[PDB]
Each structure stands twice: as structure tokens, then as C-alpha cells.
Amino acid sequence: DHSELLVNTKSGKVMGTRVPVLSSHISAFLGIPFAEPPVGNMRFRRPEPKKPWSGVWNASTYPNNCQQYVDEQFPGFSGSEMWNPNREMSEDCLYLNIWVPSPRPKSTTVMVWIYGGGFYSGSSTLDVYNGKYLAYTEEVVLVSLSYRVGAFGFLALHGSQEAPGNVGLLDQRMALQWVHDNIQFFGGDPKTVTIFGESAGGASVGMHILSPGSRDLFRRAILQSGSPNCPWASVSVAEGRRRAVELGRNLNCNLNSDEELIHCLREKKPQELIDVEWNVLPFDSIFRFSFVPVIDGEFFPTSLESMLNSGNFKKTQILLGVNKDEGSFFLLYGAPGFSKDSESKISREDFMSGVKLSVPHANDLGLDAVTLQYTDWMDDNNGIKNRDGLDDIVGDHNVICPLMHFVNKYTKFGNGTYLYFFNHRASNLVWPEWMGVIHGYEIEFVFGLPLVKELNYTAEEEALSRRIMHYWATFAKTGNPNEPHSQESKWPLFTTKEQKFIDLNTEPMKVHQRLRVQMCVFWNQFLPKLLNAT
Amino acid sequence: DHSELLVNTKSGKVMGTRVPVLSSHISAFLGIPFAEPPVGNMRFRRPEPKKPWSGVWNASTYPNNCQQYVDEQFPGFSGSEMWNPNREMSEDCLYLNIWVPSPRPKSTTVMVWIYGGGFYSGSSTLDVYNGKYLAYTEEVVLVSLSYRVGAFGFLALHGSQEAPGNVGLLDQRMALQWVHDNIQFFGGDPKTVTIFGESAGGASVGMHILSPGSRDLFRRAILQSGSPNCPWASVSVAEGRRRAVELGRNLNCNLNSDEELIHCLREKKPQELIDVEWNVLPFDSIFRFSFVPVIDGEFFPTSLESMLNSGNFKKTQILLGVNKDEGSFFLLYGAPGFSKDSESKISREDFMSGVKLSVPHANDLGLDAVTLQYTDWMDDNNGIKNRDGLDDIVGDHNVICPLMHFVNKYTKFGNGTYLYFFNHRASNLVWPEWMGVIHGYEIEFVFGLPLVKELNYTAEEEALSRRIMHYWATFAKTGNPNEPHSQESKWPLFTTKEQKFIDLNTEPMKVHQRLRVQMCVFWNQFLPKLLNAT
């Protein structure tokens, strides 16, 4: 006992590993367990704290990834595979990873990354999530947590103690509880913890901001291209229950009682559930996953919207934003006429089915309303305009406008909001041009991959990435992304009245106001009133 | 018998008068009667052909103007008074005026002007309608007709033979019948007659294009800032009847039967009806007149829309268009916050009541839909943007979009359509700047007033006016406003597929396509579907 890679925690001793980083080295503790393996009769159950172990836990290699659907649309294509599980998949997947500056800090800023993946996929071990560039460059202790996705993490039979719903959010919470209790031994300050995540991870961050049972475990938050109120991020208990039985219906399950259904589902091998999980969503849409958080009355006391209206949430500072072309990925994967290798010019016909796919809960009138809002009537048959119009529709409706709604509601009660719009397309992007500044592609800059030359980024991209990493880290440490007395351009606070935000790219910073207001007033105010009335 | 000012017609002989024009002279026959005086028991009745007279009818001075509301909002202001009656008003007002080139033509092009005035006002004798500049410059026989307006011309008790409705349209028709029968003696060609009018006059022209009983009396048509389908231009028989009894209710009338009501109304002096006529419209709106054409099953066989859809109308060539700021006059006179001498910056509050006033038949959802379509959300509190947005709303909804609807329907079955957008603001306009290119102000150029120097127009304005007068006259004569083999820029035909139109101003001609499509798809397609659904 006593060496830089050896850390003693309230759960037992762990042994890290030295890792190289930009010509220096840091410590890494990978695969530390924070919960009991959720296997056997534990499948679908709330997680349990990991029982302490004696001896030294070997924390030198990445853990297994949770059972999930694996994307095979482009076998060999790095653009899609960099998001697939890079470790063996297993239900025994509740571990976290920590990158620690060398020599070990005494009490420094802590950042906990929550991965995205639409609540049905995701891994903490992905190369784009490697925490070392950030820990090393910003001197922050970097944590990577994990959580059950799909049915494993979200099957919901409300009322049952065996499959209550939201267990994957509870998994995250448990990891946050562990960091709270032990990050000090790794030299991290448990009083200055910032949770950040992208897409479902950004939504998760917001759900922890809302949930009373989570608010006390962290200090501040960063949300990237995701909000807890996103339309794809949560369902009612009635709906969860319906999907859970439909899932049992696909696996030839006895459906007479929750106990019967649950018993059957715990019997199936993981892959059996994954093979049929896309058959349960009851309507056709851009998004085809069924298992997500439920508004249960516990993790979420009431509707997300009423909580937002009344200020029922953690008041603190937040930093959040979106990418310019949030919708392109979803279209590529779920809308007809979009392909990876063509320019995907869209027939006015494929355009109409595209909007239906995008606003599945709309009636005809609402479908017309969306169509009119996004159509250039002077040139309604332009295939590129139809393609980009659909890109905007999907991005606005599912990511950007829900986030602008969240930010405007939050700012009214919060203690400081910083908003960004990332619109720099990476020079080395392997995805087609028509996709633009793609959902997910700001992550590589948040994690500093552009500082690794072999990755072929440009010099200005390495500069953008350092500016970004420093904004994230300065904000996590102080609640402001700006250097006190620096002489760099200032990222202003987003306020209720001015609603300022900054672009995030390679050119001189520029401040703007009311990010996509024209479209978001339509999605957040008009369209809903239209559908409630009609 | 035999002299240039003496003309013998099937109704008797008439004696004209020589009139000076741009340093030359022409003949003018003013105040020729085409119907019996619609007085006494004839009030509200269909007109009767004028009984032939013996002797010579003195046609040297302007006739009386029909009984109408007189605008007194700006006593002394020439801008409003140039539209008021300039002759004594009288129920005995069914006369027409003819300007004839000297020496008398043998068989030349004839143009018949139908005045506008919202179906409650208007005179054929106005100085802006003086036919001499056009007759002289284009060698056309120019006719000016007249017709009863207000209750006198439109009180409608459908089913009654005493007050059937549309008598003012019948008045026009009778004048067209007279021109058809006698214009040859004045040297005009009855085979080449073009009816043209502005605002209610443009609507009238279109109603004659629709009405079977009128189609045979003319060859082609020009419509200026008015369409028969304008929302202010017609009512149902049920509604006409309701307004007629409400009118009787304001004059203490026995309301037990049509005969009783009608008897009472024929008893009142003209001014008694005019004094209370603005009290009958049942809702608050920008427009406050109640007496207009009725869809009666006779003059109009069926709904204007079904007639348009099925091609039930005269197939021929049409020339029509709008002014850029069709809505400013209506706002000045009927919306709060608009004044002749201020810039009329509009409070976001005065903006909301403005839209309600403008789309009186809309529910809340429809009111929101209009508001969203015209609001710049980046700068929603800009008083000039609110002022101009309202200008557009009123102009689009009441003049421009109804006309684009008419033109697109007509062109499908017609034999040639020419479309214009007049956007030149007269250099000498006496109305405030905020009003822009005002509804009604293209008339002075159609009638060639800019050729009279003392009127203080610029040299290019005299040029624009000659180009316009020549387009109107060439089109009336041939059905094409262009000179066969000229080398001037070509005004293209408006076709179903390309929808081309030209700007009409002092700069080199410019061709555009789909005049205000973005807004008109909203007013002609979306808003209606929205209100039918909700």
C-alpha cells in the first residue's frame, strides 16, 4: 500500500495504469464497479451498490459494454463503427473509468461524462470518449460512467418492483453517488462535479437536474444536443407498460400478469430481446426505439413541463448547445431517399413522407402546417432545398427547439446559462457533405482528438478544440466558461431578455441572439396549440 | 342634323362638346342617360332601359353622382377629396360619358371604365377619371359608366321583385348593353370592347366575366386591384337579407314582411339611409360597408368558387394586377394607431387588434396563424415592422391573394393572361410616406394625368404613364399589351406553369414569377383549411 496508481476507496483498493498522452503520461483507473452485476433476477431491477471487495481491484483495462443493438448499416465504415461497442457486451456492465492528472491532484475539478445513444446503445469505452486529452490538458479528474440501455435499462411495468422503469437513470445516479463518495481519494473535489453528456446523455443530464433524488450529487451541468424534454426521450407509464407487453408478445410470453411477463423476459438471452426490440414501437417514425425514461411520479415527481414551469429543479449554472445539422443522421438511417453515397436530393414526394415520419403524432392540418413553414414556395421542387428542409425539420423538432424550450424555462430560475451553436464541419469528416455539421460531431472537439496529429485535423481545428476544452473545463471549475481577466473574446451569459449565444467554430467569435426563434416559436408554441385545438 | 358633336343613337340624338387636351381638342359626350331614373318606387329595383327621347339631348356637362357616403375624415385634403362626389348627388344618376377622338373614328377600340369605391361610393365624373388623355393619346373611344352604390344599389331581399339585390351590377350591365347597341355611331367598334375598373370596379369586371347575362356584352377585361372573389365583395342571400332588415331596424321600420320593410325604406330621404348604413355590419372589421353583390342564383348561377373551378365564365384575354401597398388606406381609415400625420409605428398591442380587425372571421388559432406568418421573431417589437406587417396582412388578405387565386383559376381556361405589380410611388403624392405605393394610385397613370405638366409629375412618370396607357390600349385593341414587332421589352403571358408577371415602374422592365406565393399559399390554401378544421 502506497504508489500513484494505487488508490484506496470506501469500496476497496484499486490499481490504475499509466497511460501516455500528448508526449506525457497520466493515470487511468478503468473498469471500477459501482454496482452489483444486474444479472439473473436482477435484470430490469434497480441497481444495488457494489459490495466492497478485499484485495486490489485491477483497474487497468476497459470494462465490458452493456448489451445493445449494434449498428451494421455500414460494415467497415469508420463513421458508424466508431460508435459501436468496442468491448465484449455483457449484462455485467456497470463500471466507470477515471482519468487522473499526474502527479495526482489534491482537490481539483471533476467532470463526469454520460454517453448518448438514444437510450438503446452507447459505451463509455469508445475512442472518442477517451478522457485522457481533457484530463491532461485541463487538469481535471475525468469520469466516464455507464448504464443499461434498451429494455435492460428501461423496460417499464409501473407498479412492479421487479421492472419499475428508469433503472438506467438509476444506474447513472449510483455512479454519481460513487463519485460523490470516493472521487476525493483520486484527488477530485466532490463539491465541484460537473455532469456532461450528449444527445440521450445530454437529456439524462437534464433529467438529473430535474429529479430530486439526483440533484444533490453534482454541482453543475453541460448538455450537448439533448434536453430532458426531447420528444424521443420519455414516455408515460401507460405507454411504457404497453410497450413492455408488446415486447413480451414478440417473445411468446405469458401475458397474464406483470410477474408472468417479467419472469419470461428474464429468461431470454440478451440477444433475444435485442432481435425483436424494434418491433414494438406502435407508429412509424424517424426514431424506432421503444425503451426510454418514464414519467413515473418518483424519479420525476410530475410532468417534465410542470416541473420546468414551476422551477421544480436544481438551480445552478448550465452550459449547453446544439450542432447546426442535428437532423442529418436520423434522416440517413430512417427516411427514404437518403443514402450515404448520393447527394440525397429529395423528391417532393419523398419530402412529404419525410415530414409524416418526422411528426408522427400530427394530424393532416399539422402536417400541412409543418410543410408550409419549411417550403420555399418560389422553388418548391428543388431537391436540395427539400433535403435541407427536412434536415431542419427533424433537427428543430427533435433537438434544437426542445433545447431552446428547456433553456428558456431554466434560465428563468437558474443561476447562469451559457449557450452555443457549433457549426464547424470537421475537415476530415468521413460522412457525406450533404450531412453538414452532424449531430454528434462536436464530441471529438470536446474530448480534444484534434490535438492528436495522426488524426489529420487542421491546425485551426486543434485550436478550436483547445478553446472548447477550456471553456468546458473553466465552466466546470467556476460556473463561467470565461477566464476572469483574460483578453479573449467574452462568451456572454444567456439571459431571459437578451438570449445571447455564440457560434462555436474556427473564425473569430460572434455573438447572436434568439437561436432559431422563428422555427422554435412554431414548434414550441404554434404547432402544439394547433394539434390541441384540432 | 350633321356635325362632329351631333350623334344620332337608337335612343335619340345627343349633342357633345369640344374639349381641349394636351394642346389639341377632342369631343366629349357627357351625361348620356342609359336607364330610367331609379327614383320613387323604382328605388332598389332593377334598372329599366331609358325611354327614347325626341329632340337633342344636351351632352355637354357631367351628370349628377349617385347618392353616397361622403368622406370627410380630412376636410380640404386633396388626397381624400379627389375621390368624393364632385357633382350634385341624386338618385337620378344612371348616365355614362364618352370621349371620342377628333375627327370621329370609323370603327376603333372601345374601353369602358367601371369605377371602384367599395360598392358604397364612387363617381364617373372624378378628375382622375377624365377620359380625354387616353382617348386622345391612344385613339380609343373612352366610356365612363355609372351605377347605384350602397343600399340604393345593393339592398338585398332575395325572393322579392322589389329589392332583389345586385341592381347596381345590373346598372353597369345596362350601360354595357347601351354601348353595345350604340357605340358604333360614335365611331366605336362594338366587337372590341374592353371593360376595366379598379377595386370594386375591378371586382365588377370579374363578376361580368362570370355572369352569363353579361358575358356577351364585351370582348375583354382589365382588373385593377380587385377580383370578384374578394372577401369584401359579395355576401350570401341569407346575409343580405339580415342586413336589409337591420337597416330597417335603424330607420324604425315595420319588419313584418319584405313589402312592409321595402315600403318604409323607399320612404326615407337618401341621406337617412346613408346616415345609418354603417351601423348594420354585424362584426367589427377593417371594412364597415354592408351592401354588396349577393350570390343569388341568377346573376351568379352558383358560388363564385365553383364557377371558377369549372370554367363557368367568359373565356377571353385578361390584363390585371395590384399595387405594392394595397393595405395602407384601409388601415389609416379603420385601424387604431394609424394616422395621416404620424409614421404610425405600431405597438405590438395595436398590432394584435389590427389582425383581429383584418381577419374578423378567424378563431384564435387562425389569429395566431396569421400573426406567426407576419412576425419577424428576431425583432417582434419593431413598430415599423408591425406597421408594415399589418399593411401586408390587409393587402394580401383583401386584394392581392384573392386576385392571385382568381388569376390562377382563370388562366387554366382563359385565352391569355397578363399580370402586373405596380410599385412606383408618385413623386407628388400628398399622402404620408408610410403608406407606400397606395391602393388606387395607379389610376392616375392609367388615365395619363402625368402628361399634364401643371400636375407636377416627373419626366419619367410621364414616360411610365405613356407606357401604361399604351399597354392598356394595345391590349384592349388586340388582346396583347405588346406591339407586334416592337423592340421594347416584352411583357410575357402569365401561364399556368410559369406564372410570370412584370413590375410596373420607372426602371427597366423586370419579369418575375409567382407574385407573393409564400403569403398567398397561406391565405388561399392553409388558413382556410385551418378554419374549416378547427
Ligand SMILES: *[C@@H]1O[C@H](CO)[C@@H](O[C@@H]2O[C@H](CO)[C@@H](O)[C@H](O)[C@H]2NC(C)=O)[C@H](O)[C@H]1NC(C)=O
Ligand atoms: C447566482 O447566485 C448568486 C448568489 O445566490 C448571485 O449573487 C448574489 O447577487 C445578489 C444580487 O445581485 C446579491 O444581493 C448577493 O450579495 C450576491 N451573492 C453573492 C455570493 O455574490 C448571482 O447574481 C447569481 N447569478 C445569476 C446569473 O443569476
Ligand SMILES: *[C@@H]1O[C@H](CO)[C@@H](O[C@@H]2O[C@H](CO)[C@@H](O)[C@H](O)[C@H]2NC(C)=O)[C@H](O)[C@H]1NC(C)=O
Ligand atoms: C489520415 O490521412 C491518410 C492519407 O490518406 C490516411 O491513409 C490512408 O488510409 C487508407 C485506409 O487506411 C489506406 O488505404 C491508404 O493507403 C492510406 N494512404 C496513405 C497515403 O497513407 C489515414 O488513414 C488517415 N488517418 C486516419 C486515422 O484516418
Ligand SMILES: *[C@@H]1O[C@H](CO)[C@@H](O[C@@H]2O[C@H](CO)[C@@H](O)[C@H](O)[C@H]2NC(C)=O)[C@H](O)[C@H]1NC(C)=O
Ligand atoms: C387563344 O385562342 C386561340 C383560338 O381559339 C388559340 O389559337 C389556336 O391555337 C391552336 C393550338 O395552338 C391551333 O390549333 C389553332 O389553329 C389556333 N387558332 C388560331 C385562330 O390561331 C390561341 O393559342 C389561344 N391562346 C392562348 C394563350 O390560350
Ligand SMILES: *[C@@H]1O[C@H](CO)[C@@H](O[C@@H]2O[C@H](CO)[C@@H](O)[C@H](O)[C@H]2NC(C)=O)[C@H](O)[C@H]1NC(C)=O
Ligand atoms: C405644384 O407645386 C406647387 C409648388 O409648391 C404648388 O403650389 C403651392 O400650392 C399651395 C396650395 O395651393 C400654395 O399655398 C403655395 O403658395 C403654392 N406655392 C407655389 C410656389 O406656387 C401647386 O399647388 C402644385 N400643383 C398642384 C396641382 O398640386
Ligand SMILES: *[C@@H]1O[C@H](CO)[C@@H](O)[C@H](O)[C@H]1NC(C)=O
Ligand atoms: C491486470 O490485468 C492485466 C491484463 O488483464 C495484466 O497484464 C496485469 O498483470 C494485471 N495485474 C494484476 C495485478 O493482476
Ligand SMILES: *[C@@H]1O[C@H](CO)[C@@H](O)[C@H](O)[C@H]1NC(C)=O
Ligand atoms: C347645354 O347646356 C350648357 C350648360 O348647361 C349651355 O351653355 C348650352 O347652351 C346648352 N345647349 C343647349 C342647346 O341647350
